[PDB]
Amino acid sequence: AKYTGKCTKSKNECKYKNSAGKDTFIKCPKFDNKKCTKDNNKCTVDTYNNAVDCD
């Protein structure tokens, strides 16, 4: 089940909801598209293969 939330550009961490209903914080990629280039921005998480997309 894909998740959606926000992300921080200060520590590059995506905030989503794990497969249960809580607050999970992971580390976004350092790519040039899936990286967190904005604080409190919006990022999508894909547990299907750990494919985080920050922007």
Automatic annotation (TrEMBL):
<dbReference type="GO" id="GO:0050832">
    <property type="term" value="P:defense response to fungus"/>
</dbReference>
<keyword id="KW-0295">Fungicide</keyword>
<dbReference type="GO" id="GO:0031640">
    <property type="term" value="P:killing of cells of another organism"/>
</dbReference>
<feature type="disulfide bond">
    <location>
        <begin position="7"/>
        <end position="36"/>
    </location>
</feature>
<feature type="disulfide bond">
    <location>
        <begin position="28"/>
        <end position="54"/>
    </location>
</feature>
<protein>
    <submittedName>
        <fullName>Pc24g00380 protein</fullName>
    </submittedName>
</protein>
<keyword id="KW-0929">Antimicrobial</keyword>
<feature type="disulfide bond">
    <location>
        <begin position="14"/>
        <end position="43"/>
    </location>
</feature>
<keyword id="KW-0732">Signal</keyword>
